[PDB]
Amino acid sequence: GTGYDLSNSVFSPDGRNFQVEYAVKAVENGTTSIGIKCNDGVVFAVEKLITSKLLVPQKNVKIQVVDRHIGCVYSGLIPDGRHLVNRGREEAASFKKLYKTPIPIPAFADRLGQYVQAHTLYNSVRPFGVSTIFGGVDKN
Amino acid sequence: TQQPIVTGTSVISMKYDNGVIIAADNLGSYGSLLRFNGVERLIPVGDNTVVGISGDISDMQHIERLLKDLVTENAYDNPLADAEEALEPSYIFEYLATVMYQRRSKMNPLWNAIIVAGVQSNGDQFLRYVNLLGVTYSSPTLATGFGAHMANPLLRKVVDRESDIPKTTVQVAEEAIVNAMRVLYYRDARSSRNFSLAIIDKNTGLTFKKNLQVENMKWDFAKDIKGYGTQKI
Numbered sequence: 001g002t003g004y005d006l007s008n009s010v011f012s013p014d015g016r017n018f019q020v021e022y023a024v025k026a027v028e029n030g031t032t033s034i035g036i037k038c039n040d041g042v043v044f045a046v047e048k049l050i051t052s053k054l055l056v057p058q059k060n061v062k063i064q065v066v067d068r069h070i071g072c073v074y075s076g077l078i079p080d081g082r083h084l085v086n087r088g089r090e091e092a093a094s095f096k097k098l099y100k101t102p103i104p105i106p107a108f109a110d111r112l113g114q115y116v117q118a119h120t121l122y123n124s125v126r127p128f129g130v131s132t133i134f135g136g137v138d139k140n
Numbered sequence: 141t142q143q144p145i146v147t148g149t150s151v152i153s154m155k156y157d158n159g160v161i162i163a164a165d166n167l168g169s170y171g172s173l174l175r176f177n178g179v180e181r182l183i184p185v186g187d188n189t190v191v192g193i194s195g196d197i198s199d200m201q202h203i204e205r206l207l208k209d210l211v212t213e214n215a216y217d218n219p220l221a222d223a224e225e226a227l228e229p230s231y232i233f234e235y236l237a238t239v240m241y242q243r244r245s246k247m248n249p250l251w252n253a254i255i256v257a258g259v260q261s262n263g264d265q266f267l268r269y270v271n272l273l274g275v276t277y278s279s280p281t282l283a284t285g286f287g288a289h290m291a292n293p294l295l296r297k298v299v300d301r302e303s304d305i306p307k308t309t310v311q312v313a314e315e316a317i318v319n320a321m322r323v324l325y326y327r328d329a330r331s332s333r334n335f336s337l338a339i340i341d342k343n344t345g346l347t348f349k350k351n352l353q354v355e356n357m358k359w360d361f362a363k364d365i366k367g368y369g370t371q372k373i
Contacts (some may be wrong), residue, residue, distance in 0.1 A: 038159055068212055089216065093209065 007123045017129055019122055026129035027122045030076035033062075035133035042135040044073045067092040067102055070136040077081075084132060084137035085114055144196040144251045145307040146170055148181045149330045150287030151192035152320055153255050154295045155280055156266040156313035157306045159341035162257040165315050165324075167332035174332070180337050180350075181208055187346045188318070189229040189258035190338040191236075194284040195272070196251035203236070203250065210235065229266035231257025241274030253284035265305070280305060283320075286328045291320035291356045310339065317350075325354045 004010050005018035012018055033046040046062050063083045064072045072088065074081035091111040096105040105113075112132065117123045141177040153162040168176030181200065184192040185207050193200045204319040205300045210232065215221040233256035258266045268278045280302065281295035298316045299308055311350050317337065325331050333354045366373060 059219075061217070065215065066218065068215070093212075097205075 008119075008125065009121055009123050012108065017120060022032065023127040023129045024131075027076035031062075031128075033071065033073045033075045034132060035135065037135070039115040041137055042071070044071050044133065044135075047074050049124045066108070066134070067096070067104055068085070070105065070108060070134060072132055072134040074130040074132040080128050081132065084116070084128060084130065086113060088112055091115075102138070105136050109134070141247055142249070142251060143194065146175065146197040146201065147238045147330070148179060148194050148197055149285055149328060150291065150324055151181065151253070151284040152257050152287040152291040152295070152317060152324075153192065153257050153301060154313055155267050156299075156308040156310055158265055158310065158343055159259050159339065160257040160265050160341050161310075161313050161317050161337065162190050162255065162323060163175075163335055163337045164192050164194070164211045164334040165335040167322070167330065167334075168197050169330045172329075174330075177332060179366050180336060180347075182338050184338065184346060184348060185211065185232050186227050188261075188340065189232050189256065190265075190346070190348075191226065191232065192255045192284075194253045194258065198253050199250045203225075203239075203252065203254070206236075206239070207232070210370055224261075228260055229256055230260060232256055232258070233266070233270065237268075237270045237274065237276050240270050240272065242273060244274050251321055255282050255284060257338070257340060259340050259342045286330070287320070287324060290323055290327060293318050294323065302314065310341070313333060314339070322354045322357065 002046055004012040008019045027043065031047045034041045048060065048062060062073065062078070066072055066085060066088045070092065072085050074084070088108065088111065090107060092103045095107065115120060116128050119127050149165060149167060151162065151164040153160060162182060166177055166179050166181070166183040167174060168179040178195065183204050185191055191207060193203060196366065207362065211227065214225070214227055218225050236256065240250060240254070246278055250342055251272050253269070253271045255269050260266055265266055268276060269282050270276050273306070279329070280299040281292055283291045283295070295316055298312060321335055325333055335352050336362055337349040337352055341347070
């Protein structure tokens with residue numbers, strides 16, 4: 001029948017999660033942001049739609065730092081993006097506390113990956129309305 | 141409730157006309173055994189604050205990690221992390237003072253005596269003390285443990301009260317600090333010859349000096365002393 005798109009963790013007849021796909025629509029509606037990997041680093045850039053002349057220039061910072069070597073930028077629901085960075089900052093601090101060394105980028109990528117995937121397993125939680133571009137420099 | 145295992149002795153400090161000077165030796169004692177000699181006990185936080193810690197070394201390393209996390213946390217969502225919203229010596233101390241008192245209230249203290257030395261954003265000198273009990277106080281001169289008995293009397297001869305501070309130059313202040321480190325090496329059995337010295341000035345900034353040694357020692361008079369009372373040869 002129908003109604004497969006009402007609940008989060010529900011599989012549709014064709015093996016799809018519509019609530020996740022509906023969250024992608026919130027990202028596509030959002031501001032454009034990019035990331036460029038260079039020869040020895042990464043560069044993040046983001047558009048900042050000036051709604052009115054009342055907005056104070058160079059103040060509403062969108063790009064966020066995790067630890068001291070990871071930069072994060074996202075598109076879509078800005079509050080959802082901040083929630084993910086807050087988790088990543090806790091996740092990076094937990095890694096450094098136990099292993100001394102700052103968290104590797106592929107290691108940090110999985111930590112956010114497992115956390116976002118977790119929000120697709122239950123009907124009590126909503127999927128993240130953000131696509132996050134992130135990275136930095138580590139051991140290799 | 142715990143007991144200190146690997147320990148660090150005195151941390152001495154004083155304030156002059158333009159800033160503060162702090163010093164501590166590089167020893168990590170294991171009871172009566174002088175076990176470790178490459179221990180830095182002065183932790184610089186930013187470029188305006190230096191934290192001198194005495195007592196339990198394992199607890200010092202914990203505090204050292206907390207200070208590094210404070211710098212990381214302050215830079216989060218803060219575009220003025222290196223300007224107006226940078227970590228002040230007063231912010232760093234008050235945080236440590238809160239932790240020290242909370243741990244003693246839970247009967248699990250950090251076995252340390254800490255002196256926070258630095259210069260505020262407006263140019264004011266900062267020098268405050270906090271111990272394992274959470275007891276806090278400020279004075280023109282501050283010293284922990286054994287330095288409180290020996291270095292303080294010497295440093296108070298230079299700056300006795302608040303009015304003596306603007307009359308004291310960097311040259312005179314450092315001379316009194318280096319001299320006090322020699323006296324501590326003379327009479328403290330848990331002291332090292334090698335030490336570090338940090339100067340935080342409102343003009344020249346932070347000057348961290350490493351691998352300093354106690355020089356100009358008087359020992360020649362020992363040859364003339366023989367026996368303990370009546371012995372002549």
